[PDB]
Design a protein around this nucleic acid. Structure first.
Ligand code: MG
Ligand code: MG
Ligand code: NA
Length: 348
DNA sequence: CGCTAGTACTCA
DNA sequence: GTACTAGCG
């Protein structure tokens, strides 16, 4: 998530209703809904007790979309990104800590406190996601498990013209170069839509409305793949990018002190970290639903060697990739949990 | 004014 | 994943 991006470009947003996309196809960042609905039954999840409330919670939204003549594509997070492993470890430690503390408060008598910790302990597994997948596919709703981050997969589906809008809460979708993003959507169909073309309505951006410059800005402000230099947020990064008559981003990164008059000295590690972050935003592996193969989010440019981009996700055989995409192969255990086949009983 | 980091929150 | 803001440059 880009910390503060939604508030920074709020002039590019407008209140809409999803009836706007009647007859069209939209993709869904389902893990948001999963995280929301899991909270309704955090006690049972923490205690290990069985619960299927989040399933109905998601299917509620799904049916809401279906009622307005919309075809929703539920997209799920797949395997872990090495380039994001920091935030993943952080959140893991967080959830585990709140879990142990929750158990402690459970055996201390503290009720609401332990329940709160349980809310802050929920780890969305592929099992729950697969419950939602079966529940959705039972009603003809297409589902897709990304090879890695759902963000990149959604971005691809939107760029490929397969879907016309992305339903999510994460601002990263804009940094991935999505055209239309529906945020803050409730269970009725009311949400805030940010359009890429409307980024020009943001006076603060300046000439930083192009996909490349916008990406550079989001990265420089601080993303999930790279922490920002101390003292650098959205405004100063956008300032740097505005005051630059140079397409070569690296030289600009080095001259950040000049462009800001802040006397900043950049570490040599941060340059490579930036290269890696940009390469992750650009070339993270996604799954083609049509050709059924692992491709990068954007086509490889001639100035990059795919061999060096393992942190943007490593390749597997397209059979495995397809079985993952269908939700048959467990993301964690890598063992088969289902045997669904889109041929026997999208992807056309 | 901008940015970091801590707090609080997503359900019902 | 989010929003809010007190402390501070
Ligand atoms: Mg995501
Ligand atoms: Mg993201
Ligand atoms: Na920052």
């Amino acid at each position: 998530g880009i910390q503060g991006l939604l508030q920074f470009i709020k002039e590019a947003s407008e209140p809409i209703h999803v009836r706007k996309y009647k007859g069209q196809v939209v993709a869904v960042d389902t893990y948001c809904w999963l995280h929301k609905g899991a909270i309704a039954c955090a006690e049972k999840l923490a205690k290990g007790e069985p619960t299927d409330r989040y399933v109905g919670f998601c299917m509620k939204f799904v049916n809401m979309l279906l009622s307005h003549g919309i075809k929703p594509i539920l997209v799920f997070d797949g395997c872990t990104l090495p380039s994001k492993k920091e935030v993943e470890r952080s959140r893991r430690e967080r959830r585990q800590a709140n879990l142990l503390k929750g158990k402690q408060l459970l055996r201390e008598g503290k009720v609401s406190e332990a329940r709160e910790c349980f809310t802050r302990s929920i780890n969305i597994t592929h099992a729950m996601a697969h419950k939602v997948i079966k529940a959705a596919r039972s009603q003809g709703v297409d589902c897709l498990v990304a090879p890695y981050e759902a963000d990149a997969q959604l971005a691809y589906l939107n760029k490929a013209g397969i879907v016309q809008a992305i339903i999510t809460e994460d601002s990263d979708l804009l940094a991935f170069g999505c055209k239309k993003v529906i945020l803050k959507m409730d269970q009725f169909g009311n949400g805030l839509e940010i359009d890429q073309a409307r980024l020009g309505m943001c006076r603060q951006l300046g000439d930083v409305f192009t996909e490349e410059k916008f990406r550079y800005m989001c990265i420089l402000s601080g993303c999930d793949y790279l922490s920002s230099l101390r003292g650098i947020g959205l405004a100063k990064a956008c300032k740097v990018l505005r005051l630059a008559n140079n397409p070569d981003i690296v030289k600009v990164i080095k001259k950040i002190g000049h462009y800001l008059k802040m006397n900043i000295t950049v570490p040599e590690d941060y340059i490579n970290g930036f290269i890696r972050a940009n390469n992750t935003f650009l070339y993270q592996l996604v799954f083609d639903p049509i050709k059924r193969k692992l491709i990068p989010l954007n086509a490889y440019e001639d100035d990059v060697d795919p061999e060096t981009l393992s942190y943007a996700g490593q390749y597997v055989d397209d059979s495995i990739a397809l079985q993952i995409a269908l939700g048959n192969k467990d993301i964690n255990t890598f063992e088969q949990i289902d045997d669904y086949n889109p041929d026997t009983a999208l992807y056309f």
